[PDB]
Design a protein around this motif. Structure first.
Motif, short mmCIF file in Angstrom:
data_model
loop_
_atom_site.label_atom_id
_atom_site.label_comp_id
_atom_site.label_asym_id
_atom_site.label_seq_id
_atom_site.Cartn_x
_atom_site.Cartn_y
_atom_site.Cartn_z
N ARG A 9 50.57 35.04 35.91
CA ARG A 9 49.17 34.68 35.81
C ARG A 9 48.65 34.52 37.21
O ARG A 9 47.45 34.80 37.46
CB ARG A 9 48.83 33.41 35.03
CG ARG A 9 47.47 33.09 34.91
CD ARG A 9 47.08 32.22 33.47
NE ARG A 9 46.24 31.18 33.89
CZ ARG A 9 44.98 31.42 33.73
NH1 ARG A 9 44.50 32.55 33.18
NH2 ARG A 9 44.09 30.34 33.92
N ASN A 51 50.10 36.13 39.83
CA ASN A 51 50.34 37.15 40.59
C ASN A 51 49.32 38.28 40.24
O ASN A 51 49.01 39.48 40.46
CB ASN A 51 51.70 38.09 40.17
CG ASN A 51 52.69 37.53 41.36
OD1 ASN A 51 52.53 37.13 42.28
ND2 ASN A 51 54.05 37.47 40.83
N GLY A 52 48.29 37.90 38.99
CA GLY A 52 47.36 38.90 38.36
C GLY A 52 47.70 39.83 37.70
O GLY A 52 47.17 40.86 37.55
N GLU A 53 48.76 39.77 37.12
CA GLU A 53 49.37 40.81 35.97
C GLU A 53 49.26 40.39 34.41
O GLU A 53 49.88 41.00 33.85
CB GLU A 53 50.83 41.11 36.56
CG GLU A 53 51.10 41.22 37.95
CD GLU A 53 52.34 41.53 38.33
OE1 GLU A 53 52.51 42.63 38.94
OE2 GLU A 53 53.34 40.87 37.90
N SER A 54 48.41 39.16 34.30
CA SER A 54 48.38 38.70 33.01
C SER A 54 47.73 39.64 32.05
O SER A 54 48.08 39.74 30.87
CB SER A 54 47.85 37.45 32.92
OG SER A 54 46.36 37.44 33.24
N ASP A 55 46.67 40.49 32.62
CA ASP A 55 46.15 41.31 31.70
C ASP A 55 46.67 42.57 31.17
O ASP A 55 46.79 42.76 29.98
CB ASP A 55 44.66 41.81 32.56
CG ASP A 55 43.95 42.77 31.86
OD1 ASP A 55 43.24 42.47 30.76
OD2 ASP A 55 43.87 44.16 32.17
N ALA A 56 47.69 42.94 31.99
CA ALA A 56 48.57 44.33 31.82
C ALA A 56 49.47 43.96 30.83
O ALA A 56 49.78 44.47 29.76
CB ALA A 56 49.15 44.75 32.97
N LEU A 78 49.75 41.28 28.84
CA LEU A 78 48.88 41.05 27.40
C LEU A 78 48.75 42.28 26.75
O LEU A 78 48.51 42.34 25.58
CB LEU A 78 47.56 40.21 27.56
CG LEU A 78 48.08 38.59 27.77
CD1 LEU A 78 46.80 37.77 27.86
CD2 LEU A 78 48.39 38.25 26.02
N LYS A 94 44.41 47.28 40.95
CA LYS A 94 44.71 46.51 39.68
C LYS A 94 43.66 47.19 38.53
O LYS A 94 43.81 46.79 37.51
CB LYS A 94 44.86 45.26 39.92
CG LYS A 94 46.11 44.75 40.23
CD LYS A 94 46.20 43.14 40.26
CE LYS A 94 47.57 42.92 40.77
NZ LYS A 94 48.89 43.61 40.08
N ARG A 110 43.28 51.58 36.01
CA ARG A 110 43.57 52.10 34.75
C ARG A 110 42.45 51.98 33.74
O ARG A 110 42.14 52.64 32.87
CB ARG A 110 44.58 51.49 33.90
CG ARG A 110 44.34 49.97 33.67
CD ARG A 110 45.56 49.44 33.01
NE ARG A 110 45.30 48.23 32.62
CZ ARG A 110 45.31 46.86 33.49
NH1 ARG A 110 45.77 47.28 34.67
NH2 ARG A 110 45.19 45.66 33.14
N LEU A 167 41.59 39.80 40.08
CA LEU A 167 41.96 39.69 38.53
C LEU A 167 43.04 38.37 38.57
O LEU A 167 43.80 38.26 37.66
CB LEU A 167 42.81 40.86 38.11
CG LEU A 167 41.81 41.99 37.98
CD1 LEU A 167 42.65 43.09 37.09
CD2 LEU A 167 40.67 41.68 37.12
N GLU A 168 43.17 37.53 39.60
CA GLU A 168 43.84 36.47 39.61
C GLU A 168 43.21 35.31 38.68
O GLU A 168 42.04 34.92 38.85
CB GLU A 168 43.70 35.73 41.09
CG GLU A 168 45.03 36.15 42.02
CD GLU A 168 44.53 37.49 42.88
OE1 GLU A 168 45.37 37.88 43.70
OE2 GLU A 168 43.58 38.17 42.38
N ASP A 180 42.47 36.69 32.18
CA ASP A 180 43.61 36.86 31.11
C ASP A 180 43.05 38.21 30.44
O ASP A 180 43.78 39.13 30.37
CB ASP A 180 43.78 36.05 30.02
CG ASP A 180 44.49 34.91 30.63
OD1 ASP A 180 45.75 35.09 31.01
OD2 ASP A 180 43.89 33.82 30.71
#
Ligand SMILES: [Mg+2]
Ligand SMILES: [Mg+2]
Ligand SMILES: [Mg+2]
Ligand SMILES: [Mg+2]
Ligand SMILES: [Mg+2]
Ligand SMILES: [Mg+2]
Ligand SMILES: [Mg+2]
Ligand SMILES: [Mg+2]
Ligand SMILES: [Mg+2]
Ligand SMILES: [Mg+2]
Ligand SMILES: [Mg+2]
Ligand SMILES: [Mg+2]
Ligand SMILES: [Mg+2]
Ligand SMILES: [Mg+2]
Ligand SMILES: [Mg+2]
Lengths: 118, 129, 68, 81, 195, 224, 95
Positions: D59, D61-66, D68, E23, E26, E144-145, E148
């Motif tokens: 969360r 690292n900013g990758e929670s969206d992908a 999820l 980020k 896509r 995007l930090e 969710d």
RNA sequence: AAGUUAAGGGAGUGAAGACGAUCAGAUACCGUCGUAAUCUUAACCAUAAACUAUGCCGACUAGGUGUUGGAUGAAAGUGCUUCCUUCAGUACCUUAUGAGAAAUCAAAGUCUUUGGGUUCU
RNA sequence: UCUGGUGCCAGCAGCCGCGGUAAUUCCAGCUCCAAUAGCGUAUAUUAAAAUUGUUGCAGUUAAAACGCUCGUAGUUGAAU
């Protein structure tokens, strides 16, 4: 200088915030109201608080005052700003798009009838 | 120059695992890497892995399960006698109840418990928690 | 050396400091010298006034709640 | 852990991240749990839901969206990942 | 649905800017000749539906906070909080509300919606101190930090913000039994517009 | 006690809606009032009550224009003797208020500690489950599992903290400048905290998620 | 210590740079470290400038300018206030 | 760079030296002269904050803005420019469940979870 | 933080320090602590020292990367 400490400004804003109806644009009239509404041992600060309260009212006529919230102004403003147009502007009989955007909708296979570019 | 392929492979695996990458690539491959990967697979530390065929030294893609803590080599392959295992495992492993120290043995590649079971010694290769 | 102990609220300047504050001084003779004892007590804010009457509030300007 | 008599001796069992299996500890305050409501073929929300847990590391690292997105696409909730 | 995309085409929800911010690649369909990035608009609708389901899963609507910092997003947030049962802030953020328990406006929620992560950065910073599932509304250059669920939009147009909040509110009402589908919401856009 | 809760967790704990502190360790929630820890550890209906120990008090100076300016810092270590530990610090003008603040801070930082076995598993685990390392400033510390009868082999402060934590057997070694008491206490605490984060093989199997106390007691907490 | 990343000048991928001489004090300074100022000035001020116009033939006259291109050493430059002393975070602010 | 040997050259600057000032004193800072040297050819000497105060070879790990030299693919051209991709140099900005005693660092990271090869101190 | 004497003297103190007329540290009386038929002091040696480091140090700024490149011995070397 004649700058008013927060003792004067705290009390004076409460008087306006609680007894808005009785207060008017005359210093003498606003003075008698403050004598019985509040508790002030010395007459010198009784005069100064009332003088500030009168100064507050003149500012109200030009609109809202930042830091003073009297309900009657919001409901009168709320009715003004809920003005519904007799018809929305969201609808337009023709959708205008960019040339590159038109391809985007077409690649997705969805149909929207009146689409034309520029 | 390279001087080793096992160390680079394990280092790349370790670096990818710390980030949660779910897949990683190993550029140079060899039979020793295959045996080491198969042994980690047997103990349930990684998923399946794939061998790619170019007409040079091949390549490998592995599946990670978010489960490895550490995997490194011991560069000088010291030779170890059967009765010196205890000191090495006391120094190298985090507990007496999990973790594996890998030797290369005249009966193949195996960890220390199997090596004791087979009554043999060998040289040391690496470990993984 | 001097040691100061405080607790609560106190006033130092002006006329109210003379009315609402009580003061006392004493000394104790030890075998090594003499010690000075100073006590200042701020009374509950009543302190009957010029016109003989309790001045419950020295400077506070509380506003009454409008009758419902 | 169980002792020799098959008695559990841990005081509790922490959770694991759904994306990395990372075993969230007791002071990690960047960890969240998400519930997604379900419909009943008519488009109204019944009482059912689906749950995912995301750790503070991914969360941050900013990758929670992908992650999820992929996790929901597995559960037949999206059409892409 | 066709007409939602039609309305999104009438407003400018599909135009972003430069600064692609990889980020968000896509969610972007292409880049025009003047350098502007185009948002796919088929993923926007689906992400909006999933966000609505997540929101409706909450037991009482009061455990939801919606925040906007810019002047032309205050009407939309107030109306959205009115028709739903959430709480709105709409302006200056006090830097200790989510983390200082002695303060006058503690108001600890269970979920938090953001108009723009770049300007409401203090809100999203404080969320990661109390286990709050942030959901935002991101442009082509948003960070995007601590985000969710991201809905691809543009945070700059007043029409865009009004339309997106109107769509989210209508969908939330459909997922409850207040009004059934095949009947449009009786209230009209331009109730959520600024000024 | 007759205290007025300020946070939702305080309201839930004030009534019997939460059975044990492990229920909120599981959901990683913050704790903002020491009355929760006081409630969960009462001298009655509790087998092991908490204990305090003021381990160090030191003075610090600011040296303004008209001479110096001294005030004191307090280090307190709190412990259960079975699976729980905490550490706190506070600076103030007088020693008593400093120790009060330090005691309050130590309770708010209470954590669980995982305990294990050396060799074969029998009743009542007694040592660390695996080697752990802690670090603060220039100080590094390492703790390793030990057999049944070997007591704590460590410096007085290490023995103290591990006795509060409930650990009976351990070897240890340290590096750096350990005469700095605060950094060395914090390093030991950091090493102790890491036990419940290691993912040993017996923790591999997946379990389903229980629901948070906020979701479970939403209606009762809304009634207020 | 080590108060600047570039060391007080802009040199990379090089060994030696030839020096120049300060316009005010004559000192030797390497070229990549002196502060350069290029000034376009007028021959006279605006009052004496319009006296030359009305004493002139050609009925439409433009006075020429001057081009100088001065260079200074650090000491001779910050004493004359072409460059000032700044705070730690502001030191990084270029252009 | 300075310094030594020999033959040239020798405008400007100018260790030494001589004067004129300031100063309590001024063998100094300022000013007027000025010898060696500084330049060329043929030989020595082997030292500098000779500094990125960071040895060399190889692997891995993150986003953005530039710039110097090739190559591929597409558009505005009076087979040339702009854009895209890629290789090799070279800087800067943001951020690091990375590191440090800190200053700070894209390596000074992948180190009590300590071992890729190797020389010097 | 007990009682007398001395007063930067006499002296003590492995190290930090004490002593200049109200010394918890000198000289004594009393009382307490430690080990105990044993207990002090001097020199050497081991651990403490991951302060000699194979396991296991450090080299931008704390001590420390040769001015730079070539090169023999030595050490180390892709996949089948
Ligand atoms: Mg006065
Ligand atoms: Mg140089
Ligand atoms: Mg000559
Ligand atoms: Mg001459
Ligand atoms: Mg001359
Ligand atoms: Mg010559
Ligand atoms: Mg040298
Ligand atoms: Mg050097
Ligand atoms: Mg090492
Ligand atoms: Mg004595
Ligand atoms: Mg020794
Ligand atoms: Mg040694
Ligand atoms: Mg040792
Ligand atoms: Mg050393
Ligand atoms: Mg060098």
């Amino acid at each position: 200088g004649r700058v008013r400490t927060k003792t004067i400004k705290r009390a004076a804003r409460q008087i306006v915030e609680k007894y808005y109806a009785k207060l008017t644009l005359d210093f003498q009239i606003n003075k008698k109201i403050t004598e019985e509404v509040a508790i002030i041992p010395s007459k010198r600060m009784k005069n100064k608080v009332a003088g500030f309260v009168t100064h507050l009212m003149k500012r109200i006529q030009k609109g809202p005052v930042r830091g003073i919230s009297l309900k009657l102004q919001e409901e009168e403003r709320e009715r003004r700003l809920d003005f519904v147009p007799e018809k929305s502007q969201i609808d337009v009989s023709v959708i205008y798009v960019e040339p590159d955007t038109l391809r985007m909708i077409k690649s997705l296979g969805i149909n929207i009838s009146n689409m034309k570019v520029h | 120059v390279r001087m080793s392929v096992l160390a680079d492979c394990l280092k790349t695996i370790n670096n990818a695992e710390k980030r949660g990458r779910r897949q990683v690539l190993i550029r140079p491959s060899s039979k020793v890497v295959i045996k080491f990967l198969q042994y980690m697979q047997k103990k349930g530390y990684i998923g399946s892995f794939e061998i790619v065929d170019d007409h040079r030294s091949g390549k490998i893609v592995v599946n990670l399960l978010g489960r490895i803590n550490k995997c490194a080599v011991i560069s000088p392959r010291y030779d170890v006698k059967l009765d010196e295992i205890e000191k090495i495992i006391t120094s190298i492993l985090p507990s007496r109840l999990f973790g594996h120290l890998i030797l290369t043995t005249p009966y193949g590649i195996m960890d220390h418990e199997e090596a004791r079971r087979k009554h043999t010694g060998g040289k040391v290769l690496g470990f993984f928690f | 050396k001097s040691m100061k102990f405080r607790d609560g609220y106190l006033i130092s300047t002006g006329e109210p400091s003379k009315r609402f504050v009580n003061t006392a001084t004493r000394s104790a003779q030890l075998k090594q010298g003499v010690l000075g004892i100073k006590v200042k007590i701020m009374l509950p804010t009543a302190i009957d006034t010029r016109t003989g009457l309790t001045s419950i509030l020295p400077d506070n300007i509380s506003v009454l709640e409008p009758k419902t | 852990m169980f002792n020799d008599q098959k008695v559990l001796v841990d005081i509790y069992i922490p959770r694991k991240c759904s994306a990395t299996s990372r075993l969230i500890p007791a002071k990690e305050h960047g960890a969240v749990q998400i519930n997604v409501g379900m419909v009943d073929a008519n488009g109204v929300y019944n009482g059912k839901t689906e749950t995912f847990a995301i750790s503070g590391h991914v969360r941050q690292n900013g990758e929670s969206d992908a992650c999820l997105n992929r996790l929901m696409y597995e559960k037949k909730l999206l059409s892409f990942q | 649905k066709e007409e939602s995309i039609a309305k999104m085409l009438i407003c400018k929800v599909h135009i972003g800017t430069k600064n692609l911010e990889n980020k968000m690649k896509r969610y972007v369909y292409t880049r025009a000749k003047d350098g502007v990035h185009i948002i796919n608009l088929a993923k926007t609708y689906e992400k909006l539906q999933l966000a609505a389901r997540i929101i409706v899963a909450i037991s009482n609507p009061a455990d939801v906070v919606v925040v906007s910092a810019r002047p032309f997003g205050s009407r939309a947030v107030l109306k959205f909080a009115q028709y739903t049962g959430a709480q709105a802030i709409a302006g200056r953020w006090t830097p200790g509300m989510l983390t200082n328990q002695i303060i006058q406006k503690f108001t600890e929620p269970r979920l938090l919606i953001v108009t723009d992560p770049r300007t409401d950065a203090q809100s999203v910073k404080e969320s990661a101190y109390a286990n709050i599932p942030v959901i935002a509304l991101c442009d082509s250059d948003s960070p995007l930090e601590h985000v969710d669920i991201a809905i691809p939009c543009n945070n700059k147009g007043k029409e865009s913000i009004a339309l997106m909040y109107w769509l989210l509110a209508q969908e939330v009402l459909y997922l409850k039994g207040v009004i059934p589908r095949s009947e449009p919401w009786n209230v009209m856009v331009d109730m959520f517009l600024w000024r | 006690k007759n205290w007025v809760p300020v946070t939702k967790l305080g309201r839930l704990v004030k009534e019997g809606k939460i059975v044990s502190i492990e229920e909120i360790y599981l959901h990683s929630l913050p704790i903002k009032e020491y009355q929760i820890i006081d409630y969960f550890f009462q001298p009655n209906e509790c087998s092991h009550p908490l204990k305090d120990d003021v381990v160090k008090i030191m003075p610090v100076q600011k040296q303004t224009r008209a001479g110096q300016r001294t005030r004191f810092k307090a280090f307190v270590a709190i412990g259960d003797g079975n699976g729980h530990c905490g550490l706190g610090v506070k600076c103030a003008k007088e020693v008593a208020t400093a120790i009060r603040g330090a005691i309050i801070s130590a309770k708010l930082s209470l954590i669980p500690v995982r305990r294990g076995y050396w060799g074969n598993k029998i009743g009542d685990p007694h040592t660390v489950p695996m080697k752990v390392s802690g670090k603060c400033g220039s100080v590094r510390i390492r703790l390793v599992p030990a057999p049944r009868g070997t007591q704590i082999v460590g410096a007085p402060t290490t023995k103290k903290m591990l006795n509060f934590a409930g650990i009976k057997d351990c070897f240890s070694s340290s590096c750096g400048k350990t005469k700095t008491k605060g950094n060395f206490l914090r390093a030991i605490f950091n090493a102790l905290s890491k036990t419940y984060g290691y993912l040993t093989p017996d923790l591999w199997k997946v379990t389903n998620f229980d629901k948070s106390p906020y979701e479970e007691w939403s209606d009762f907490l809304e009634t207020y | 210590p080590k108060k600047r990343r570039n060391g007080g000048r802009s040199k990379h991928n090089r060994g030696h740079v030839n020096p120049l001489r300060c316009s005010n004090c004559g000192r030797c300074v390497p070229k990549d470290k002196a502060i350069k100022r290029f000034n376009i000035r007028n021959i006279v001020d605006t009052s004496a400038q319009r006296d030359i116009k009305e004493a002139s033939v050609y009925s439409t006259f433009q006075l020429p300018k001057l081009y100088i291109k001065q260079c200074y050493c650090v000491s001779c430059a910050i004493h004359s206030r072409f460059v000032r002393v700044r705070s730690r975070e502001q030191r990084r602010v270029r252009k």
